[model samples]
Target: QELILSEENKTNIAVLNLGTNDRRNAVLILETALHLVEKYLGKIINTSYLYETVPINELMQNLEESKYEENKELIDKCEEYETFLKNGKVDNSILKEVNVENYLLECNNIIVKNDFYNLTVVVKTFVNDPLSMLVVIKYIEELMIIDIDILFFNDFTIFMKNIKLEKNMIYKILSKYIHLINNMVDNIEFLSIPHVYTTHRYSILLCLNDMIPEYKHNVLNNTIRCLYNKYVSRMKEQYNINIKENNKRIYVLKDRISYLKEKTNIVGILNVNYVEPKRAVQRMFEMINEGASVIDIGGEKISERDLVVPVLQLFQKEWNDIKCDAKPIISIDTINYNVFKECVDNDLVDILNDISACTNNPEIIKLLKKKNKFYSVVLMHKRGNPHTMDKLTNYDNLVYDIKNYLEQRLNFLVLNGIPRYRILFDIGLGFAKKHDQSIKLLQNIHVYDEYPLFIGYSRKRFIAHCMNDKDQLLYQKNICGGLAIASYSYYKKVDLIRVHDVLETKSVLDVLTKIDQVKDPNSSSVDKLAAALE
Candidate 1:
């Protein structure tokens, strides 16, 4: 019999570690990185944070009584790629415990009660010297289940070298690898590799090819379709449930699937001064026509006039000429409150029809409140600076300020001829946050009273910090984090998650949807339609 999947079923989780401007001790950093893989990305990671010496003796005594338990799966998984560890050729007691510099660290633990996903992370660790390290990992389950793990360590002591493993090491490593292989040769397939950034795309191709063999195309397609329904189509249903779910076994959410389906809209985003609004939106529509969805324009649209004029121009163009399917299925964002206010007052549903926002400026928030133009509000918590993804030291203030700003905006919009029902609120995970702040914000997704939330922690600077050097590890780590974020968002019942890579996002979402549906047979079939992001 055929099966159907719901939108909520295809959810995933991701966690990232970043920031190490002043430190050294590559191996110590790598040691913690392994656990990140065990917790976030769905795989084991071979990290460059290697150490010449790890104080294993000290670790053994302390680790047994530590609050957070060690991840045995990670230590075992690493044997797959560890030249010495895998072979069992060399017996080093280092596997017993983890030792970073003497810095008091505070990592967070986030739980999604409904899904088998959670994040327990270390935000800061002090090692031998004055230096630090960062690591990021993500989990996604769309077309295929995915887990991305990346590490960035600060150790200028030894230049990186792709040295060959000793013969004994190789023999031992191969033996251990075969042992693992025998237990689950085909149970939960794994496609994994250790890549130093810059030239790692080949590594990605290699991994994907191994995991997604040629014979599984049909299964992959079906999985992707199931995810679409559970996460996207069922958003409105979630919003309904959040308001009325008495048993509370489920969550209610909101989204833009129907709107996008009706108007064939795609969305995009940009940093504050990077986007040229008019052309950005126009180009976005073009991509959507070409089959792109959920894109970031990289901040090309600069101001209010730029945003409004260009969008207006595109709406006038022939829908066919817009070339929607050939492009991504999304449009870029703007910071100008006036344009949004105008759209609300004039009922300019076209602009309102698409375009997500991450407004923090009080003026825009105030305008929204006065006019009371209610549409779903999209909120994002940005990093305070690049290279830092810390926990929100100002958790209370951040949430309070945002809520106040949102209410003010809603009231302003009402004064300017807007409706209350049109607004939804989203909290930005990585917007202006310190190192690890994104993870902290994400841990509290269910805090708000109303509106939907969106998370966009796509391959940013933080993920790169997980490796040896940002210059080399950027791309590889970013892709992994993107997939991880997609999966985690679904698990949290997030309405929309912005990403730079839609193909990968689609793949992860598909796997998640399949997992959810397979667990419950009575789910509806209509929820299983897959709309390719193209």
Candidate 2:
């Protein structure tokens, strides 16, 4: 079965956590980001602002005890929706006690309820400072499943001081949010508190990774502390800010750049094609140090067929020269049996990306079966080599035909005793397809989700078609296209990405992978962590 990605199934919610001073400022700043999100990502967004500065304890107290004790109709409605809660119903007894006014502020009558395409944004003040925000959380929890993203603006310490709250209280409040995440409705799969941030001015939206226990303890605390120290230094030197109260709360929230540099699921591969063997090794070192998980050495056009043995040998020699205990996986992008056999027999290739799918010999599976250790085999869908692009460009259903071709070959390898885990599918973008076909393949790329998928759309001819003015290729658009594909692939969770512009593609991946790491499957929006930067 194909895993389809559509707006109907995914939703993106942005919560703007603003201090009183930043509320008015957040609107315009957030409006721009929301506009960009809408323009580029096609998300229906609605943002509302509610301003109230109440102490945490008082707000909590009011939320627990309301004046409408005998409001039977509202209580019934609350219970009906409260079925979405973990216990099957909201405590009507508790609802009778909560301050409804605090929870139900005048929404300014900006009606956009009709655009319910899975994503919902319910902006609020900081947690418990106005526990009224919890009512919104509960309300949204009723309509559909949601992943909670706690967004903070500017320094956490300053926000803490402004609200006159201690850090330990914040930690305790977050734990309750985590509890809500843990007890999601039956249909919900993942519900974790993913935090997001911006400077006081709302300059950019950055979604922090989920606040799982391990992240909170090891990575998250130190990052906040480091960011806080930098903030303090800058504030003292340039900004006229007062620290009336100090944060004395215990730090909570534990939260990397390598495709493996940061311990993420996505693998970033560098394709050192067109470079000389020695320089290719040097380029491999540069990308490996910059955080590439895999290195693919080959990119000969039909007229230029470079032998793979010498290149693989150079990379292997270079790999040994590096003194690091952690080495990047090495792969060769070629279509020669002798070269493939040499790399495999010498234990040089970690990934055998045979773009031709070994058309000349089906018995190459025999060579792969002999290897004791696990190694990935990228079975790309192309009629022939890159040189035979003219004949293979025709397809009845580009994506489906590619999928069928790969699936048949996948079965052949698995039947021959190669592990399914070691087999990855590639769409062979631009190898044997027109520009529009490549785009179509990307649009429906999720159909290949049944297998680990790989895409090497970096600097391909299709990018040149989109950007080039003449018969020549445009360099900048190729990079732009590469980065764009990198973001899309990151969002789709493509297992491995084969790219030529490793560092630039990685820079794009670094930002995207962060958002992807924390992105709620139900929603896809930058507003997932709306904030006003200073």
Candidate 3:
């Protein structure tokens, strides 16, 4: 499917803060912007898989080890060159006057059977010379003649240390190379983005104001702007996409008193509430009073049928007894199909919390469809069951894997008569996840911008992990970690946050939302969090 960014069906714009990593920042911005352009033009070229024909991985290993030794020897030789230039002394050379032309010839003549070796070694040898470096770029361009679709910037940054070029200028130059390749290959369809270096922030997009005065009002660079505008116009022309102007501020989910969509709606699902119905009802009221738009009922410790059913029944009874219209939305947190069915049957449920993705019973979808009411379903990526979750902890690529799984499950639900809006995605913080994994998910939650994201970090083990505290009470006291994460999620436009301490989370959200609304766009998340704490 074509991922089009629109106002009505909004998507997250990932703002990468590249801090002071100049080269990385500029290069990343160029790459991301060019990638978007290629995507927009349907000209992205993907041929990296062709390298599988050669033993690229083994060759890479050899290059790493052998090249390190080679570079050390070259550096030692360069020391002699530096000495020869300084003291007019020849230590291990035939002639004191070394031939620069002869050295260039040697660099050009050095050949290898493997194309990968030839490209890499040739460039590394003459990287300091501008003319020879041009030859390397030409050789790379010549390689592109066959079927090369992407410029592999694997050792590009390392080679960068040799070239005396400004990072901004290099990025500007490299962008032209991308355009040139696209023009050369008419059928190119993808570019493989490689992780080159680490950065605190990344400039995912480059602005037009940096280059063009006429385009000063635009946020994206000229190319990205043109392409996105083209895509939007084409979408409107072909698909009749009703381009709705987004309201500056509005709640997505609104009830009598709560505006859940205005900011991230805090879901206060206390641990004590699940086992005791009286406490559950009381806690529900407390959360609602304390600004919880949605109240989740269940605990990681309790899945018993007797307890689960009574909690839902008693909570519903209490809600009815209040006879209030501005009650918080009730969501049943359960994996049991029976509990799910009972909630839907009794009309006590506004949201269905199924962390298992409901794969164990396809009947869950049937139940959801049977209700035929506007109900939100919490779809999550998980393996096996909650009891043996440790076994399910292994992942090849955590974020990508979860995103894929959630997308697949989301497609299943949408295909099976579930409206997209009625479905919300939850990255189960404590379930089948390590501490780092949980933190990673929180940091990159925008990867799931296609749907409304719900993250519950309330009293999870990850909190204790954050504080490095084994004591549960300490975890509760160290609410800063949770609030900090929640603030970041809110900054990322995460739709909902499930927390134990509603008042505190709401306070954080209040501070964050205000900062987001009023502060300069350049304000960092750390600044906002610090302000929130104050």
Against the hidden reference, what TM-scores do the models get? 0.38, 0.45, 0.49
Using TM-score as the yardstick, the better of models 2 and 3 is 3
List per-prediction Cα lDDT, in the order shown.
0.35, 0.45, 0.47
Sort all candidates by lDDT, best to worst: 3, 2, 1
Candidate 2 per-residue lDDT over residues 290-347, each given as its tens digit: 6677777665543223545666677778667656356677767666666667777787
lDDT of 1 by residue, 4-43 (tens): 1111111111112222211232222322333333332333
Q: What are the candidates' C-alpha RMSDs? A: 26.9, 21.5, 22.4
Using TM-score, give the best candidate's number.
3
Quick one: best lDDT, which candidate? Answer: 3
Number of clashing residue pairs, candidate 1: 147
CA shift at 84, candidate 2, in angstroms? 47
Q: Which residue ranges in model 2 land beyond 4 Å of their true spot?
A: 1-276, 299-307, 468-473, 516-534
Comparing 1 with 3 on lDDT, the higher-scoring candidate is: 3
Question: 2 or 3: which has the higher lDDT?
Answer: 3
Clash count per candidate: 147, 28, 11
What's the residue-level lDDT of 507 in candidate 2?
A: 80
